């Protein structure tokens, strides 16, 4: 219901999981008005094809403030057609406007974060790719949610989703049991946002990231697909990412309980949501 020739390229935002995002001013009465928005397209198989389709559904069926707003489709190769959000990226936004982001706001945010995943399972869909760099700021006040590329429905029947065909992944912030058996729950996306809550306190240092934080404790030397194994045997011997610089003991509590092994133990986005909420009324 967009056409393409009223689709007018001001500048690239990203690239994604498979396809890339690009700005664009939407202009149907070929005057200088119209909205600008966000237009994802694929670099694409038939695999890719049909997950863009259920990634489009599924952004389609969510209505939320801490989710980025569905706008529409644009057929001649298909195009998803996106709020645009000027802040960008938690992660770049975060970089750039360190200084005057305290520990308060950074509770906001993962609040923000919290709802809108406790809103994600009440559909039973499940992130999968949780993390700063997938999450948009609205403004100093509002995040969204963005990129359900890689996002799944759980069956009627089963608590887990096991993901054929595993590519290159974000394996850092993989729980376990998403490393071993590539089993994917609301518990896994409740580890995932456990390195999100982690990825903020450390306000994105460089050297302070997962992947940084992990090689130091598996050695640089280690290599190719032994890295993944090494991961698997450290997280099993219960090694875990350190304490950021800065971190209260009450806000590393919530990140090392997402890190349990049991997948069971893990506790709830409803509690999270609470938890971080009184925390933040702490202060
Ligand atoms: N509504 C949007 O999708 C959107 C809106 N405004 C934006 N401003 C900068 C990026 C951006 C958007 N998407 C970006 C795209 C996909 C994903 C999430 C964003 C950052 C990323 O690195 C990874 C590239």
């Known amino acids: ?125 499940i992130h999968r790719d949780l993390a700063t760099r997938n999450i948009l700021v609205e403004n100093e006040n509002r995040v969204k949610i963005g990129d359900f590329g890689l996002t799944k429905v759980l069956p009627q029947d089963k608590e887990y989703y096991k993901v054929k065909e595993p590519g290159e992944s974000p394996i850092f912030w993989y729980a376990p049991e998403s490393l071993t058996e590539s089993k994917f729950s609301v518990a896994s996306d409740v580890w995932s946002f456990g390195v999100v809550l982690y990825e903020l306190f450390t306000y994105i240092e460089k050297s302070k990231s997962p992947p940084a934080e ?27 990412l350190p304490r950021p610089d800065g971190c209260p003991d009450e806000i590393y509590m919530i990140m090392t309980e997402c890190w349990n092994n049991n997948v069971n133990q893990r506790p709830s986005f409803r509690d999270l949501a609470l938890r971080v909420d009184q925390i933040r009324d702490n202060m």
């Open 1 to 125: 219901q967009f056409e393409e020739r009223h689709l007018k390229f001001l500048q690239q935002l990203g690239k994604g999981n498979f396809g890339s995002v690009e700005m664009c001013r939407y202009d149907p009465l070929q005057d200088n008005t119209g909205e600008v928005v966000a237009v994802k397209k694929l670099q694409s198989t038939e695999e890719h094809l049909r997950d863009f389709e259920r990634e489009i559904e599924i952004l389609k069926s969510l209505q939320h403030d801490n989710i980025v707003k569905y706008k529409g489709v644009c057929y001649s190769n298909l195009k998803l057609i996106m709020e645009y959000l000027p802040y960008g990226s938690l992660r770049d936004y975060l970089q750039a406007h360190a200084e005057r982001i305290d520990h308060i706001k950074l509770l906001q945010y993962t609040s923000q974060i919290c709802k809108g995943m406790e809103y994600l399972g009440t559909k039973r869909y």
């Open 214 to 240: 992990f090689m130091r404790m598996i050695g640089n030397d280690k290599q190719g697909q032994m890295i993944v194994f090494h991961l698997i045997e450290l997280l099993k011997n219960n090694g875990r």
